[PDB]
Amino acid sequence: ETAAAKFERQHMDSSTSAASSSNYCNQMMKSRNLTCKPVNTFVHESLADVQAVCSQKNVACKNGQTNCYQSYSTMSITDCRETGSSKYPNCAYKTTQANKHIIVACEGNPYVPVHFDASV
Amino acid sequence: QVQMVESGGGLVQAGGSLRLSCAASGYAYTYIYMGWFRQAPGKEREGVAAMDSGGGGTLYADSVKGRMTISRDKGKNTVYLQMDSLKPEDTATYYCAAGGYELRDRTYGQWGQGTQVTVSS
Ligand SMILES: [Zn+2]
Ligand SMILES: [Zn+2]
Ligand SMILES: [Zn+2]
Ligand SMILES: [Zn+2]
Ligand SMILES: [Zn+2]
Ligand SMILES: [Zn+2]
Numbered sequence: 001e002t003a004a005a006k007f008e009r010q011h012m013d014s015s016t017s018a019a020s021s022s023n024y025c026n027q028m029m030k031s032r033n034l035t036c037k038p039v040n041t042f043v044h045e046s047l048a049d050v051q052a053v054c055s056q057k058n059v060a061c062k063n064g065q066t067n068c069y070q071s072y073s074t075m076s077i078t079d080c081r082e083t084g085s086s087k088y089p090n091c092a093y094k095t096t097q098a099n100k101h102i103i104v105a106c107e108g109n110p111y112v113p114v115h116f117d118a119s120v
Numbered sequence: 121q122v123q124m125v126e127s128g129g130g131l132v133q134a135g136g137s138l139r140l141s142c143a144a145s146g147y148a149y150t151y152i153y154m155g156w157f158r159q160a161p162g163k164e165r166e167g168v169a170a171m172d173s174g175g176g177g178t179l180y181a182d183s184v185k186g187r188m189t190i191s192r193d194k195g196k197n198t199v200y201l202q203m204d205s206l207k208p209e210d211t212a213t214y215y216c217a218a219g220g221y222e223l224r225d226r227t228y229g230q231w232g233q234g235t236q237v238t239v240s241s
Binding site for chain 2: 054055057058059060065066067069105106107108109111
């Protein structure tokens with residue numbers, strides 16, 4: 001798995017415009033092999049719209065590096081957060097729909113996302 | 121589209137000086153890192169110098185330390201390479217690059233097309 005494909009497994013869902021039930025994060029955190037991962041975001045936009053962020057607004061990454069990029073547009077995202085009834089073998093998540101700007105770190109000679117940093 | 125504009129390459133005698141200029145044209149914010157890379161035939165692309173948009177974060181490959189100065193206009197998408205005491209081993213294509221981190225070229229996404237620098241003997 002390249003860093004780009006890890007980013008797509010861990011955060012992309014082009015197959016929906018927005019989380020489809022209060023169980024979306026229970027169905028997807030297990031399904032993309034993240035179960036617990038306390039917090040995670042899926043982005044409901046096409047792969048090309050997410051790759052286009054790597055040539056938009058350059059900002060600092062949380063890890064101190066400086067190749068992160070924040071979307072000019074708000075995007076549909078699902079925020080997945082551990083409830084208070086969730087210890088790992090059975091991991092329960094609160095599904096929350098949001099429209100937000102995203103920040104990703106970008107790499108490669110196809111210059112593409114390899115890390116989801118934040119949303120704002 | 122952002123366009124990397126990039127001038128100053130050419131042909132000088134050993135010990136001579138050149139100055140490379142570069143601007144990211146059409147970008148409305150300020151790229152945090154901009155730096156310079158080079159590549160001789162059949163050889164790895166290697167980092168030469170990088171600098172952040174505040175004048176800080178400066179970095180140099182050891183083979184050019186003492187002989188090339190990078191500089192930028194603070195808060196702007198320009199970067200310059202002043203090359204002094206050039207050697208035959210400095211003969212290479214030199215590329216402008218913007219928007220990445222230090223001399224980690226995989227982190228850079230905007231690249232200029234490169235100008236020849238040749239140093240005769
Ligand atoms: Zn779209
Ligand atoms: Zn906004
Ligand atoms: Zn959308
Ligand atoms: Zn991630
Ligand atoms: Zn991060
Ligand atoms: Zn390198």
